[PDB]
Design a protein around this ligand. Structure first.
Ligand SMILES: Cc1cc2nc3c(=O)[nH]c(=O)nc-3n(C[C@H](O)[C@H](O)[C@H](O)COP(=O)(O)OP(=O)(O)OC[C@H]3O[C@@H](n4cnc5c(N)ncnc54)[C@H](O)[C@@H]3O)c2cc1C
Ligand SMILES: Cc1cc2c(c(C)c1Cl)N(Cc1nnn[nH]1)C(=O)CO2
Ligand SMILES: [Cl-]
Length: 439
């Protein structure tokens, strides 16, 4: 059984490994050069690995290797210029944590894993077009030289700007719905010396909320941090358009993030040399063309990054796609079944990711969460906070969102017209928890 995968990123490399070790003949094409071929060139991007992604790597036999290079994040460290930052633990103990991993290093581990299983990877070749009728595709290098290949099954794991998706959209209406996101983002750096000087906790995810914009920082093994600024592209107030150069960015940080600016030694340089990224939510009505082509990961469901679940979801997709392809009656049945299974969950995490921005960038909120804590301690089997369901369990995203709604409305009604917990009867709410939330 033969398969061609476009995109040696995260979902594409994992699915290549899962299929190759199950006896598939896998050819993987990547536009970029092989990152394992060391050059004289300078990437420090990292991201949050959670249970969904970790479990996928576990099935693939790669979790231990990945986690050996990951920094444990036990909770959120929220920074507001006046208050001292105190850790908000993510869960009960160190089993409920998030892992900060270098993106390039994760990709290199996955690349070795795909080749170890027997997949052939071809770099410096980007997909340009697909001829579905003749079952041929065209690739080219950066210099334009074109190369045609026959294909039997085409997997689009080629990112938020998928060329496979573009080619599919010409032979079928994919029912695309693009919801633009006003925030851009910029990557900045904190050195190991600066993070130590300012006593920045290494085993935590750091947030500098500020309403319509915010900063986060994730730790690295060498105690450096990668900082991400999230800020509106244009003003409808601060925006990227008002930050014309690095000196403008410095003044912006000194006023709005005074506690963080002194840690950003290379702010001016990083701001001018690192391009501003774009965010969006893109929903598709269908992800496949017959039994010929299918999308997964960011190619299928671009999402805003405010829940740190895009990679985790993409690796989850890879496991599911490989499972369906392995045991289906035929490729067409597999792709339809894969799409039917994962589409509702992708929509759920896309919606939860958008909702989560409000939860971070920022009364009744505190009393509700207090009661939620008591309910969790009374019925840890039934009342599980949505964040923990998304982050530390493998419950289908849509199921996690549905239970999260039941719980939010539960706490909202119980707290309504109550000044404090002393006036709330905790037994009747537990009764409602047992009534509406199975274990
Ligand atoms: C700022 C930011 C922060 C994020 N933080 C997190 C986080 O903390 N946790 C998390 O889980 N997710 C996070 N995400 C999301 C995560 O990065 C993506 O969801 C994930 O990388 C998607 O994996 P993928 O394999 O589908 O796509 P990618 O990882 O983008 O892989 C696509 C691959 O295809 C290649 N390619 C592209 N076009 C072509 C072509 N025409 N031909 C051949 N190859 C091609 C690319 O070079 C690349 O190697 C974040 C995203 C952003 C933007
Ligand atoms: C880029 C990114 C990555 C993440 C998270 C967030 C906000 C962002 Cl912006 N989150 C969600 C979260 N919510 N509250 N604390 N963490 C995580 O858990 C780690 O992955
Ligand atoms: Cl994300």
């Amino acid at each position: 059984r033969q398969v061609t995968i476009i995109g040696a990123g995260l979902a594409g490399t994992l699915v290549a490994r899962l299929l190759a070790r199950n006896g598939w003949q896998v050819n993987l094409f990547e536009r970029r050069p092989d990152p394992r071929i060391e050059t004289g060139a300078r990437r420090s991007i990292n991201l949050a690995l959670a249970e969904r992604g970790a479990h996928a790597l576990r099935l693939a036999g790669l979790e231990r290797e990945v986690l050996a290079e990951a920094v444990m994040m036990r909770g959120r460290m929220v920074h507001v210029p006046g208050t001292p930052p105190n850790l908000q633990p993510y869960g009960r103990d160190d089993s409920e944590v998030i892992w900060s991993i270098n993106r390039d290093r994760l990709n290199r581990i996955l690349l070795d894993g795909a080749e170890a299983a027997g997949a052939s990877i071809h770099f410096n070749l980007g997909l340009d077009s697909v001829d579905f009728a003749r079952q041929r595709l065209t690739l080219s290098n950066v210099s334009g030289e074109r190369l045609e290949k026959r294909f039997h099954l085409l997997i689009g794991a080629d990112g938020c700007n998928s060329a496979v998706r573009q080619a599919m959209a010409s032979v079928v209406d994919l029912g695309e719905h693009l919801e633009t996101q006003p925030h851009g983002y910029k990557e900045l750096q904190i050195t190991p010396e600066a993070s130590a000087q300012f006593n920045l906790e290494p085993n935590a995810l750091h947030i500098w909320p500020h309403g319509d914009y915010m900063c986060i920082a994730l730790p690295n093994l060498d105690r450096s941090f990668t900082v991400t600024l999230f800020l509106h592209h244009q003003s409808p107030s601060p925006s990227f358009a008002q930050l014309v150069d690095g000196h403008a960015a410095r003044r912006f940080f000194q006023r709005q993030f005074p506690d963080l600016s002194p840690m950003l030694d290379s702010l001016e340089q990083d701001f001018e040399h690192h391009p501003t990224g774009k965010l969006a939510t893109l929903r598709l009505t269908t992800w496949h063309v017959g039994g010929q082509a299918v999308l997964l990961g960011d190619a299928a469901h671009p999402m805003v990054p405010f829940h740190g679940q895009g990679m985790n979801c993409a690796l989850e997709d890879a496991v599911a796609l490989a499972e369906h392809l392995q045991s289906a009656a035929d490729n067409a049945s597999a792709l339809a079944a894969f799409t039917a299974q994962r589409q509702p969950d992708a929509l759920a995490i896309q919606a939860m990711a958008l909702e989560n921005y409000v939860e971070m960038s920022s009364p009744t909120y505190l009393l509700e969460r207090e009661l939620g804590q008591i309910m969790a301690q009374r019925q840890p089997t039934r009342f599980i906070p949505r964040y923990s369901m998304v982050t530390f369990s493998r419950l289908p995203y849509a199921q996690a969102m549905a239970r999260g709604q039941i719980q939010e409305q539960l706490l909202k009604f119980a707290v309504a017209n109550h000044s404090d917990l002393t006036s709330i009867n905790l037994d009747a709410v537990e009764h409602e928890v047992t009534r509406c939330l199975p274990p």
